[PDB]
Symmetry: C2
């Protein structure tokens, strides 16, 4: 039986700017680094950055909707978004769903998100206003 | 600050086979589905499958090392891996370069992993058998 997400590994084209982005800009804790990768944590999340020459710096129009959302409190959301904006981090989507969301790109074009709100909160909103074809279990 | 992973969203090309893979084959909990997506949980992971016409079924030699690992206990690991193998689930990696792991593909070629152990345990293992150039903070 699977008990949760063990780790998220992102392939990166250049290790130093990716470490700078996740550790310094996004405030994650750097636990270890080696010639071809790094381990960071963000709350319970174990993040691995893996240097991979096959990673392309990918424009958002050229990747699908797969994306990775990090939790932040409502009270902290606006100043964190402003920090990303000051740093020139690109946005790939505007928020049109429930709960604050900021959609931003990492240095290689990985699609990231800041989101406020849990699955329970989303399900409650969906029960009141179900998406087309929505069934609950 | 950021406090962990709020959700993982995977773009999928065909919603029903992807729901079946995560719910039936991997045993995740299905909470809701709709014409364009589904919400599942795996422990405290919120997984969203999002139907995306841009998603392509991608062979593992065509994608980079970005991957998603799910936690499993030492007692359950081998039989779960063997069940996936017997079910014909495609693979993408064989060499255990980061501990006890089984590397397998979802229907669209998303790179998945079963892994036994925490970040703390992986750091302790790496102190004895470190990756080249490894530094610990
Ligand atoms: Mn999202
Ligand atoms: Mn892994």
């Amino acid at each position: 039986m699977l008990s949760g997400l063990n780790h998220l590994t992102l392939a990166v084209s250049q290790l130093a700017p990716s470490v700078a982005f996740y550790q310094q800009l996004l405030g994650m804790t750097l636990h270890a680094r080696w010639d071809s990768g790094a381990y960071l944590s963000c709350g319970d999340l174990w993040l691995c950055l893996s240097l991979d020459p096959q990673r392309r710096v990918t424009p958002p129009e050229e990747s699908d909707y797969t994306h990775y959302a990090f939790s932040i409190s409502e009270a902290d959301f606006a100043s964190f978004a402003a920090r990303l904006e000051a740093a020139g981090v690109a946005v790939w989507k505007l928020n049109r769903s429930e709960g604050a969301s900021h959609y931003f790109l990492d240095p290689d074009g990985h699609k990231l998100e800041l989101h406020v709100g849990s699955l329970a909160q989303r399900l409650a909103a969906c029960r009141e206003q179900p998406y087309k074809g929505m069934v609950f279990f």
